[PDB]
Nucleic acid binder design. Structure first.
Ligand SMILES: [Mg+2]
Ligand SMILES: [Mg+2]
Ligand SMILES: [Mg+2]
Ligand SMILES: [Mg+2]
Ligand SMILES: [Mg+2]
Ligand SMILES: [Mg+2]
Ligand SMILES: [Mg+2]
Ligand SMILES: [Mg+2]
Ligand SMILES: [Mg+2]
Ligand SMILES: [Mg+2]
Ligand SMILES: [Mg+2]
Ligand SMILES: [Mg+2]
Ligand SMILES: [Mg+2]
Ligand SMILES: [Mg+2]
Ligand SMILES: [Mg+2]
Ligand SMILES: [Mg+2]
Ligand SMILES: [Mg+2]
Ligand SMILES: [Zn+2]
Lengths: 166, 153, 238, 308, 108, 148, 292
RNA sequence: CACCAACUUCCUAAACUUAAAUUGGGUUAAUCUAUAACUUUAUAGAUGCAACACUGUUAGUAUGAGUAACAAGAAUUCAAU
């Protein structure tokens, strides 16, 4: 196995100088060996990416999937330790920087078939990972405007050179 | 093509549909507030409304008695329908049942649920959706418009 | 064909907790060894007004010699060199040096400068933190204030009035409790101890006594929320 | 949450204001619709005379249903009832902008509520000073037959004896098979047929190694725009604005349809007799009878037919 | 019919990460004014409703004890009274259910 | 391998030939074993050829380090900052002598695909071609079909 | 030049913030208890003269941050961004409370204050614009009003339909900026200096200073713009969603100085109005509003 | 009244002249032993001495696929009615 995610919480940075931007706090949390498919868990983990802590919890509370309840519990555990252990002043001042699903250690069983034949069943397990960063969620991406697109086209033209000559 | 058909397909078939709704109706009459799936509660609401109409017809009506006998499997409820529920709803012309949606069932099937009740029952009041007060900003502006329009002809 | 289902057996506790088990208590064949004793034999009550004094106390101890000096005799009986005249200075050396370890986090040295009742009360709440403690001049000289003795332990409470600086930080270097560099004057009572019997026993810092009449300490910079009672639907607030 | 939220007209209204807004919105519908009742006295556009080859505007109507009808010869004709309902002219383009040879007029009928509509549609009608309409449609109109926007149209715009074309969306049949969608024969019930009764047979030939585009396959059936050509007008009810059209019309009851003069070769220039720009009741040149009939029609209240 | 070729992760990643297959975000989530817990706009609060039903179960328990057996439903109206309350004139001739607890604030 | 590798253009470190030619190689490090069969040839290089190379190149600092060693190695450092290392294991004097001279003549520039054999900073003397060159003007600059 | 006035006024505003902020030494903890219906019994220990009611809402959850427009600190409405001074009881008010009178007034004042800012910068620097007062009108009146005295050269000029439309285009640009409503309680001495040129403001300042036992006056700043206030204001300019400058009416008895009142209507994000309902309410907001 | 074009040939540097079963010869990866070397080497002596392919063997993990398929009568006061 490998369990690096837990140790990411033990990094100690040196004291910051007075004339330096305040470093945002970072919290890493995971749940190992969830009886759930990592593929099915991906959709839940994907959905809350980039959302704030309260926004993510609202979306999870009204979802009908099993993993939705599991991810909610991990987020609450992560939220509490951030205030309790990582000197996060405000509970609400958190957003989901990273959230992903990983394969776990599964089991092999037999699924019976009609004619004295069988197949290899897999009892799937998964991991869930999150990193929470203090501060408001980063602003959403803005689509490129028509003028923005046109300028890139002109830059593409201006980069041209005479090819295969002095 | 199921255009114009006013019934859901429930249970094991047409007879099974009636018996399933019949049991829900019998529970509603006894308890006056029932939890069921939204689709089934919606299907049973129509029979809940019409049953009260038959009770209004009167005890001496033979058609009402036969209909009440069929639908109420527990026969102690027949006096209740004619002597309790029907007297309660004498004033109303309709809309005896109040049906609302409650959170999804937390039982791994995540069914859509509803609470169906007869109006005027003795149970604790349901937490109904309550509209905003006239004191809110939008309502006051609308209230201001109403006063001017009526007063100025 | 197939492979067999081996059940494939900080883990034994869960194993036996789920299964349940009769854990009969066991008599330890070797007695556990204690080099210090939790608590203070007699908690010295600091006289009111002992602070804000800008030797009289030492005279009071001379009066309490009836219940204290006899203990000193025992301290001499096992060492014969413990003199309260010179001890004050040595006490400061431990205190100052011990606190300095925290800056480096040389937990190795601390174990040789503090007892097993002070190390857990000096480092436990500093893991994943970077303290910065510096000693400014001492306002007045240290003085012994209370000597007690009980296998056989002796405790010599010392009174110190000094000026210090503390600048604890988080994992991320952010300031959490204190001013980067500003002296503040502190009057704290320290309780040293020693294991008289052991040939390799010396004087180490055991605990500190906090007078009730002490001023409140500086508060943390951050703002806290104290949650109110959490109520299930049955319950109602009161 | 500092995020998107949903709202609807009723969310923030109180119990009293709920009724007030309903009455107000319905009040506005009344005043706006009575402002446009008099086109000819509101700067009507110049009225050109009819010339050969002209095409005039058409109407949008609602489908009421069907009923029987008889002629003086005793024949029975099943007829469909179309009601012209809140039909106004909405927009005008010139020949150039429409890109056709001919110009375009957009008409609209069956006023609807204003509460679940996009802001764009509401602004379009607020400029025109009309309550919103259920549907827009485009009619090809020659320059002589142009009518100013905001002009109401009425069932009297048509007269018994003219032939008309109706286009509407057909009844939807959902996803269907191949037998009910294209009338394929299918396969036998018995004699060894295994799991193939209503199935398509061979898609194509083995050589082309593909399926031709446009091959008929199972799919969604109905809900398509279709047109019926050459339907006679038997009678018009001026009081209720009802048109009696021979035979069947595509769509379900209460479906909106597009009514315009027939484009078949025979009735090429039959709109000479009909009101050329449109029928103006505000002009009041002569007051029409409540019911207009075609000569062959046997009217009820007449003596029983005796083919003497 | 069996696959003629294994499907690549690049083809599969397009299928299962298509927007049609992703979880849709909800805009209908709001707070209950009374309890401060989350709810959807068109559904009742699951926390306030939980209070009502727990009280309802208690009342229905008391009704069963009074009846003592099946097929004992009254032919007269029912009413619920809490400690410190006595039947009024309008309450005459109606089955009375008595509850030890004080009248709940919401219950009127 | 061209698409699988990087490329650059022809260049010189500091316009090496314009004003004065400067030798790019600036340091050679040779580590040897007093007694090791693999380092025999390198040992003879020190005995015979190292001093003559050092004199010919006075801007190259040469370091010879006899030490208990398993492979003799040559490290060459250049002014532009490139560092090159060579295994000298079991090489004759002729091979090591040949290799050392190649390092001196080279520049620190990476030996990767060079896009063009030539390079100029002033490609044009008479003016670079643009579409208007070889187009005759018109009276009043009238564009085609313009009435005026 | 108008730019000089804005620069000088801003400096004094910035200077006053530092002066009062410096006056409070160290960090002092204050017990503020949550007395609201939801999450009752919570106690926030906060830093005296630094923490604000918004910071208290930050602890609980983001819902309080979005939905709380004002708070009752010991029974009085407090600006969400106004620093707390002592241990107290706090309750959060939203637009949808059963008795939003306090919130309605605070929103109504803020919309008028924004209306003043847009007007002053709309007109050309050649002409002179003098703001006189922000009248206190009930929400039932149908529109918020701001009184302005313009230049004599414009006395015969009335804004056209597009002129009022442009005035609204800028308001929907102040909203997009999402500017916080800064708050200061300042002594009369500083307030008069910041508003020395405007005689109308000076007398207004005198009335407010007279009312209170001290000479403390309430100053609020939106970006560069600064103004006196009748009371608390909305946290940010992003609360507004719908805004409209409706009608300009010139007060008839205005011979010595032609004082023109510009009216407007707005609705918050939380209480939005349908397309038709907005129309009717705006049309009813184009009629002269008397002050009662 | 010609141009273009296959290292066919010339040119700078070099090189010395044509499917594949089979045949002659020159080196070499790895590991062990002898004697040395001492950040991983040299000369010898050895060998289970080198795998993109046997519907190879074992194990692991994909694809098909989150697909085919699988399951608990109803209400309530819930080893209950
Ligand atoms: Mg078998
Ligand atoms: Mg498988
Ligand atoms: Mg259908
Ligand atoms: Mg249907
Ligand atoms: Mg057949
Ligand atoms: Mg068959
Ligand atoms: Mg082909
Ligand atoms: Mg593709
Ligand atoms: Mg050749
Ligand atoms: Mg070959
Ligand atoms: Mg082998
Ligand atoms: Mg291999
Ligand atoms: Mg194969
Ligand atoms: Mg193989
Ligand atoms: Mg798979
Ligand atoms: Mg498939
Ligand atoms: Mg299936
Ligand atoms: Zn609630």
């Amino acid at each position: 196995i490998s369990r690096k995610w837990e140790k990411k919480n033990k990094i100690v940075y040196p004291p910051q100088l007075p004339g330096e931007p305040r470093r945002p706090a970072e919290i890493y949390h995971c749940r190992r060996q969830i009886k759930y498919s990592k593929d099915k868990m991906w959709y839940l983990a994907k959905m809350i990416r980039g959302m704030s802590i309260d926004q993510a919890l609202a979306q999870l509370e009204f979802n009908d999937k099993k993993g939705a309840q599991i991810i909610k519990e991990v987020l609450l555990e992560a939220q509490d330790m951030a205030v309790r252990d990582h000197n996060v002043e405000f509970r609400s001042n958190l957003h989901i920087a990273e959230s992903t699903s990983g394969r776990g250690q599964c089991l092999k069983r037999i699924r019976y078939h009609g004619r004295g034949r069988f197949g290899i069943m897999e009892k799937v397990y998964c991991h869930y990972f999150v990193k929470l960063v203090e501060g408001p969620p980063p602003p959403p991406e803005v689509p490129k405007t028509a003028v923005d697109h046109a300028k890139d086209y002109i830059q593409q033209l201006r980069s041209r050179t005479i090819i295969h000559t002095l | 093509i199921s255009h114009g058909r006013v019934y859901r397909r429930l249970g094991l078939g047409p007879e099974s549909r009636i018996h399933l709704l019949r049991n829900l109706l019998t529970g509603l009459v006894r308890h006056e507030r029932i939890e069921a799936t939204w689709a089934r509660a919606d299907e049973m609401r129509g029979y809940a409304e019409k049953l009260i109409d038959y009770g209004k017809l009167g005890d001496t009506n033979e058609r009402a008695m036969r209909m009440a006998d069929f639908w109420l499997t527990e026969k102690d409820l027949i006096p209740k329908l004619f002597k309790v529920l029907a007297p309660r709803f004498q004033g109303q012309n309709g809309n005896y049942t109040r049906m609302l949606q409650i959170p999804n069932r937390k039982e791994q099937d995540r069914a859509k649920m509803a609470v169906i009740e007869y109006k005027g029952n003795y149970l604790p009041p349901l937490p109904l959706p309550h509209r905003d007060s006239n004191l809110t900003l939008l309502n006051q502006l609308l209230l201001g418009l109403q006063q001017d329009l009526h007063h100025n002809q | 064909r197939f492979r067999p289902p081996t059940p494939e057996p900080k883990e034994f506790l869960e194993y036996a907790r789920k299964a349940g088990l009769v854990i009969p208590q066991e008599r330890l064949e070797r007695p556990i060894h204690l080099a210090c004793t939790a608590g203070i034999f007699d908690p010295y009550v600091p006289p009111e007004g002992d602070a804000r004094m800008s030797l009289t106390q030492r005279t009071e101890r001379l009066r309490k010699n009836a219940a204290s000096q006899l203990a000193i005799r025992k301290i001499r009986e096992f060492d014969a060199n413990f003199k309260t005249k010179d001890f004050p200075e040595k006490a400061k050396d431990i205190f100052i040096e011990a606190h300095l370890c925290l800056n480096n986090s040389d937990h190795d040295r601390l174990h040789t400068l503090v007892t097993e009742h002070c190390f857990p009360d000096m480092v436990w709440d500093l893991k994943y933190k970077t303290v910065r403690w510096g000693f400014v001049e001492s306002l007045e000289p240290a003085q012994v204030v209370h000597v007690r003795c009980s296998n056989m332990y002796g405790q010599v409470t010392v009174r110190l009035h000094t000026r210090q600086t503390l600048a604890i930080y988080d994992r991320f270097g952010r300031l959490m409790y204190g001013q980067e560099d500003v002296p503040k004057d502190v009057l704290e009572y320290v309780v040293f101890e020693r294991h008289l019997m052991n040939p390799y026993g010396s004087w180490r810092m055991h605990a500190k006594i906090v007078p009730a009449w002490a001023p409140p300490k500086q508060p943390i910079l951050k703002t806290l929320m104290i949650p109110g009672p959490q109520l299930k639907p049955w319950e109602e607030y009161e | 949450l500092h995020s998107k939220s949903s709202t609807w007209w009723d969310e923030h209204l109180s119990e009293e204001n709920l009724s007030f807004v309903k009455q107000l919105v319905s009040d506005e519908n009344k005043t706006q619709l009575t402002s446009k009742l008099n086109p000819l006295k509101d700067e009507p556009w110049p009225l050109h005379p009819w010339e050969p080859g002209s095409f005039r505007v058409g109407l949008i109507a609602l489908k009421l249903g069907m009923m029987p009808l008889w002629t003086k010869d005793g024949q029975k004709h099943a007829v469909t009832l179309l009601q012209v309902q809140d039909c106004h002219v909405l927009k005008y383009t010139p020949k150039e902008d429409h890109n056709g040879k001919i110009a375009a007029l957009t008409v609209g009928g069956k006023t609807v509520s204003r509460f679940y509509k996009p802001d764009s549609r509401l602004e379009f009608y607020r400029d025109l000073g009309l309550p919103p309409k259920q549907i827009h449609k485009i009619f090809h109109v020659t320059d002589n037959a142009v009518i100013k926007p905001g002009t109401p149209l009425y069932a009297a715009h048509f007269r018994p004896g003219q032939y008309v074309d109706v286009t509407a969306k057909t009844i939807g049949k959902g996803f269907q098979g191949v037998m009910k969608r294209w009338g394929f024969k299918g396969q036998p019930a018995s004699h060894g047929q295994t799991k193939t009764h209503r199935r398509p047979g061979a898609i194509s030939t083995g050589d082309i190694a593909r399926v031709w585009p446009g091959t008929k396959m199972p799919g969604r059936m109905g809900n398509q725009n279709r047109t019926v050509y050459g339907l006679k007008v038997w009678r018009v009810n001026t009081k209720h604005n009802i048109i009696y059209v021979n035979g069947s019309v595509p769509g379900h009851k209460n479906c909106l349809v597009k009514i315009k003069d027939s484009t078949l070769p025979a009735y090429k220039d039959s709109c000479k007799n009909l009101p050329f720009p449109t029928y103006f009741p505000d002009g009041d040149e002569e007051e029409l009878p409540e019911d207009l009939f075609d000569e062959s029609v046997w009217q009820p209240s007449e003596p029983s037919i005796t083919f003497a | 019919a069996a696959p003629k070729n294994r499907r690549t992760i690049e083809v599969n990643r397009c299928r299962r990460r298509n927007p049609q297959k992703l979880i849709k975000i909800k805009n209908n989530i709001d707070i209950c004014p009374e309890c401060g817990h989350l709810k959807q706009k068109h559904v009742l609060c699951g926390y306030c409703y939980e209070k009502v039903r727990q009280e309802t179960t208690k009342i229905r328990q008391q009704i069963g004890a009074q009846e003592g057996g099946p097929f004992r439903a009254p032919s007269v109206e029912t009413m619920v009274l809490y400690t410190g309350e006595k039947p009024s004139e309008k309450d005459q001739g109606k089955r009375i259910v008595e509850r030890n607890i004080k009248r709940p604030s919401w219950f009127t | 391998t061209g698409r699988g590798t990087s490329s650059r253009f022809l260049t010189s470190v500091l316009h090496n030939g314009l004003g004065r030619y400067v030798q790019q190689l600036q340091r050679l490090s040779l580590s040897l074993s007093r007694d090791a069969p693999s380092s025999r040839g390198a040992r003879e290089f020190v005995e015979r050829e190292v001093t003559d190379f050092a004199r010919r190149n006075p801007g190259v600092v040469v370091y010879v380090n006899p030490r208990p060693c398993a492979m003799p190695r040559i490290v060459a450092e250049y002014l532009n900052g490139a560092v090159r290392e060579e295994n000298v294991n079991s090489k004759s004097v002729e091979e090591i002598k040949s290799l050392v001279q190649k390092l001196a003549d080279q520049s620190g520039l990476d030996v990767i695909r060079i896009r063009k054999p030539f390079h100029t900073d002033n490609p044009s003397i008479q003016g670079q071609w643009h579409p208007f060159t070889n187009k005759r003007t018109a009276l009043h600059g009238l564009r085609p079909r313009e009435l005026r | 030049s108008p730019t000089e006035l804005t620069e000088m006024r801003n400096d004094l505003f910035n200077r006053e913030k530092s002066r009062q902020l410096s006056l409070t030494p160290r960090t002092e903890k204050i017990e503020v208890k949550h007395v609201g219906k939801t999450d009752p019994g919570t106690v926030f220990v906060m830093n005296k003269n630094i923490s604000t009611p918004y910071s208290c809402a930050m602890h609980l959850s983001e819902w309080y941050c979005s939905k709380s427009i004002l708070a009752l600190v010991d029974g009085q409405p407090w600006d969400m961004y106004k620093p707390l001074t002592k241990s107290c009881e706090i309750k959060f008010l939203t637009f949808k409370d059963p008795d939003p009178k306090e919130v309605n007034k605070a929103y109504w004042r803020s919309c008028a204050m924004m209306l003043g800012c847009v007007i002053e910068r709309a007109f050309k620097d050649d002409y002179v614009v003098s703001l006189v007062r922000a009248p206190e009108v009930p929400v039932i009146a149908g529109a918020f009003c701001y009184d302005v005295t313009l230049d004599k050269r414009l006395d015969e000029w009335m804004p056209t339909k597009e002129n009022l439309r442009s005035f609204t285009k800028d308001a929907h640009a102040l909203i997009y900026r999402d500017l916080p409503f800064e708050t200061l309680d300042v002594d009369a001495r500083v307030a008069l200096e910041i508003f020395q040129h405007n005689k109308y403001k000076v007398d207004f300042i005198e009335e407010k200073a007279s009312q209170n036992p001290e000479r403390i006056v309430k100053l609020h700043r939106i970006g560069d713009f600064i103004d006196v206030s009748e009371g608390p204001l909305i946290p940010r300019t992003s609360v507004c969603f719908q805004y409209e400058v409706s009608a300009v009416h010139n007060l008839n008895p205005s011979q010595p100085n032609l004082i023109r009142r510009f009216q407007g209507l707005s609705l918050p994000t939380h209480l939005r109005a349908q397309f038709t309902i907005w129309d009717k309410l705006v049309e009813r907001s184009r009629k002269m509003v008397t002050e009662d």
